[PDB]
Structures are given as structure tokens and as C-alpha cells.
């Protein structure tokens, strides 16, 4: 509760829905005196963290965070941040976990972890391309993608990798709506037969969907206890990863 | 101030120093170990710094990423540069980069590579450019306040390469030529055998906020490239300035 902590708390009130805040609104949101808020915001301004907007005593974020964000990206890339998340989730669920990222117009699994617990596991290879309609990861990404991107993906004929793969675009749109609503996607043998997957979307600093964090398990191990333990563990790990990359969830995502 | 002191500690991080120990940070800042430790723990609690996985060293925290995204939602300069950089690199066949004023320093924060040649000028984002040794630096000084130019030129100028111009009178002469033509050129002042062209980028208040540049090897600076790079770069620079709601001052030729 020191002066450095107080100043940095003021920055937390800025979000994509509130990019400019006036001195009076900052005073009301923070609970601090106007003079305290003014003094602290002046100190943040001299450091280039905040700046006064031309019209009235309003503040917006400053340009000196840009250099620091570039160094943070260099220090911890998304796949480096995923290593601990994937390791911990694999240990908690006893199943294979993987992070897939949007690489242009496709979704590619780029990092994974195996659990120590079971000898029979869902095996992966990095740079494996996942379908948008046949994987939980793909459905999680599609559900938070632009309507035009979803339209493009569903206009193109949908390949049936397995006899269980969803080929009906109306059925995929129905599933998308359920994932949008609950913030979690499930898929049983749409990419690989006898694999039950759970996935949550990963959002970047700009609130756009980056990819998905998933738990791949054999159908034979999808017990009532696992069906109820995997979703809270995966949701928590997804939010933890989003935090390690400075991501922000869109309003349409339930928390 | 304690806020300003804490944020000065973050300035010691650069692409060559992404991890710093408490002792090295004490050495670099000039503050007592206990002061550095208290300030860094306050930054750590806020997510601005964090302890490096295995080591007992410090690195930058994820909070700066969240704040840069909000800054970019307010002033979409690096997001707008992506398309401009890509197109200019394709047109010139050379590496293009946008550098922005980060307080008192000029940092390269976005770049693009051309697919044309296998050999190119390679970069890293957050690289600090000299005001006297780069075309980008000269473009920014030429449209900076006389007091800022005076400060930069009063401090002795380091020679990064044997070609770096270290005479302040010669730099002032070059600044005047950039102010007159709206474009800066520098041959091997930052990196040997690199010929770069740069134009200033302006904000809504008509103050320079950085520079857009084309970095090429000297061996590829042909008469045709010497003719083609300046019109293409000037156009790309104007395009970027207007996208961020910027305006050129009267002293800038169009």
C-alpha cells in the first residue's frame, strides 16, 4: 500500500472499454484524494507511462510502455510461458495438454506436455495442423473469431478425418454458439478416433483470439470424475496463460 | 520521486540485457541494494517485473504487454506500420523499420524483411539507434527542439564504426540538409556497409515522434535504387503519419 503500489493501481483502471479516464473519475474509481491522483499521474506522465489528452484533464496510457513490451516479448515468448502451464495442467489432469496457435489462416499445435501418471497417453507432434471443425481447439478458436472468418471456414467443404467428424455447417454453428456461451469446447473423436478433448481459447493483449489451450484424453479414461475435474483445471490454466502474455478477454467470453 | 525512481530501474533492461540480478542492478542504478530490492518488489507485486524461472535474477513482467495494447488501441502506430513496412520492403527489396521516441531515446520497434534477396540488413526490436549515427536518428533530430538537439550534441558522440560522424558541426550541417529535403541518408555510421534512408513521422500536434527507414547493404545501393528508394519511402512515411491522425509542420517539404 506504498506510493509506488498506489500509482501502479491507477493503471489497472484502464482497459479496452476505458482508454481515457478523467481526474475526477480516477478519484472515484481509486478511492484516493484528487490531489493524490494528480500527483501520482504527473509522476507516471514524466516517466512516459501516462499522458494528458488535449481536451480537458483526461489521461490515457503513454508511449514508453511500447519499448518495455518489446523486451518482455523477447524475454518470454508465448511458447516459453506455456511450458509451466502445460506441465502443471498435465499433472493435475493426468492427460496430454497442448497449446495451438493461429499461424495465418490455420491452427497449429506448437507446444505440448505429457503427464507422468498414465503409461497410455494421447501422443502428439509439434507443428500438427488442427481442423477448425474437428477439434475442441479449432471450435474454441472459431467461436471467438470474426463472423467473416467463420463464414469462410464453413463455406469451404469440411473434411471428415474420422467417421465421427462433424460435416454439417449448421451443426458446427450450433456448437460454436454453445462454446461462445460457456467459454469451453469439447470434441469426441472428430480429429482422432477414441480421443476426448477439452479446450479453452487464449486471448492476446488486443483481446483477439490467438489460439487454444487443450487437454486430450483417451475416451476410455473420460470418467465422471475426470469430466468434472478437467473443465475447472483447464479454465484456470487458460486464464493463467492469458496473464503470462498480458492478454485480455473480450466481453463475449464468460469469467 | 519514488514512482520515477522505480520506473528508472526498468530502463536498464534492453535486448542485450533481458535478465538482471539485484547486485548488477544496484551497480547500474547507483541506489542502495535495499532501495533497489524494495522498488523491484513493489514492481513485482504489480506484475511489471518478475523473478527469472530458475535464476535469482529479474526480468520484465507481463503488465507492460497489457499497457502497450491499450496504448496501441489509443495510438495504433505499430499496428498501422505492419502493412506499410511489408509493402515498402517488397517495393525496395530491402529491410524497413519504424523507430519511435521512447523518452530521450530512439528505439526500433517494428520492422519487415523483403523476400527478394537472401542477404539483408537484420534487426531486433527495441534496438536503440544513435541520433548522430543513423538516418532515423538524423531525421528525428532535424525536426526536434533546438534545446533537444543542443543536449544531444553537447554530450560527446560515440563512434560505433570507423565511419560514424562524431563532429557536432558536421551533424548540425546534416540536420539542416534533412530539414530542407525532408529525408535523411547515412552510410555505415551505426553498422558498417549499411546505407539507410529515413523520413520523420509526425503526431497530431505536428511534433516528430519517430522515423520510418529503409536499411540496405551498400553493395546493393545502385543508381536505380538511389532513385527508387526516396519516392517510395516518402510516400510510405506520409501514409503512416496521416493514419495516426498526424500532421506535418510547415518546415517539412511535401
Give a concise summary:
Chain A: This is Transcriptional regulator, IclR family. Chain A: Keywords: Plasmid. The structure is a homodimer. Chain A is built from nine helices and nine strands.
Write the layout of secondary structure elements.
Two copies of one chain form a homodimer.
Chain A: H1 3-11, E1 20-22, H2 23-30, H3 34-46, E2 50-53, E3 58-61, H4 65-75, H5 78-93, E4 96-103, E5 106-113, E6 128-130, H6 136-142, H7 147-155, H8 169-182, E7 185-188, E8 195-203, E9 209-218, H9 224-244
Task: Please tell me about this protein's structure.
Chain A is an alpha+beta fold. Chain A has 2 domains: 2-63, Orthogonal Bundle (Arc Repressor Mutant, subunit A); 77-255, 2-Layer Sandwich (Beta-Lactamase). Chain A has helices at residues 3-11, 23-30, 34-46, 65-75, 78-93, 136-142, 147-155, 169-182, 224-244, and strands at 20-22, 50-53, 58-61, 96-103, 106-113, 128-130, 185-188, 195-203, 209-218. In chain A, the strands form 2 sheets. Chain A has a 6-stranded antiparallel sheet, sandwiched between helices. A 3-stranded antiparallel sheet of chain A has the order 1-3-2. Chain A: It comes from Ruegeria sp. (strain TM1040).
State the end-to-end CA separation of chain A.
27 Å
In oligomeric terms, what are we looking at?
homodimer
What name does the CATH topology of the largest domain in chain A carry?
A: Beta-Lactamase
The number of strands of chain A is: 9
- Give the CATH H-level superfamily of the largest domain in chain A: GAF domain
Strand proportion of chain A, as a percent range, falls in 15-25%
Computed CA radius of gyration of chain A, to the nearest angstrom = 21 Å
Global structural class of chain A = alpha+beta
Sheet with most strands of chain A: 6 strands, antiparallel
- Per CATH, the class of the largest domain in chain A reads Alpha Beta
The strand order across the widest sheet of chain A is 6-5-4-9-8-7
Keywords (chain A): Plasmid
Protein name (chain A): Transcriptional regulator, IclR family
Organism (chain A): Ruegeria sp. (strain TM1040) (Silicibacter sp.)
PDB class: dna binding protein
Amino acid at each position: 500500500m506504498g506510493t509506488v503500489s498506489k500509482a501502479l493501481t491507477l493503471l489497472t483502471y484502464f482497459n479496452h472499454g476505458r482508454l481515457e479516464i478523467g481526474l475526477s473519475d480516477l478519484t472515484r474509481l481509486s478511492g484516493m484524494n484528487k490531489a493524490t491522483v494528480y500527483r501520482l499521474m504527473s509522476e507516471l506522465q514524466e516517466a512516459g507511462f501516462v499522458e494528458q489528452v488535449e481536451g480537458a484533464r483526461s489521461y490515457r496510457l503513454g508511449p514508453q510502455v511500447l519499448r518495455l513490451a518489446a523486451l518482455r516479448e523477447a524475454s518470454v515468448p508465448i511458447l516459453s510461458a506455456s511450458r509451466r502451464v502445460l506441465r502443471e495442467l498435465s499433472e493435475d489432469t493426468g492427460e496430454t495438454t497442448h497449446l495451438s496457435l493461429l499461424q495465418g489462416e490455420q491452427l497449429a499445435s506448437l507446444s505440448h506436455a505429457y503427464s507422468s501418471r498414465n503409461a497410455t497417453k494421447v501422443m502428439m507432434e509439434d507443428a500438427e495442423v488442427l481442423t477448425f471443425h474437428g477439434t475442441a481447439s479449432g471450435l474454441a478458436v472459431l467461436a471467438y473469431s470474426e463472423p467473416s472468418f467463420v463464414d469462410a471456414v464453413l463455406a469451404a467443404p469440411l473434411t471428415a478425418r474420422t467417421p465421427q467428424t462433424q460435416t454439417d455447417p449448421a451443426a458446427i454453428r450450433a456448437e460454436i454458439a454453445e462454446v461462445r456461451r460457456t467459454g469451453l469446447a469439447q470434441s469426441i473423436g472428430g480429429f482422432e478416433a477414441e480421443v476426448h478433448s477439452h479446450a479453452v481459447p487464449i486471448f492476446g493483449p488486443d483481446r483477439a483470439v490467438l489460439g487454444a489451450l487443450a487437454v486430450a484424453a483417451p475416451t476410455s479414461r473420460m470418467t465422471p470424475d475426470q469430466k468434472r475435474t478437467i473443465p475447472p483445471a483447464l479454465r484456470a490454466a487458460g486464464l493463467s496463460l492469458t496473464e503470462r502474455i498480458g492478454g485480455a478477454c473480450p466481453p463475449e467470453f464468460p469469467t
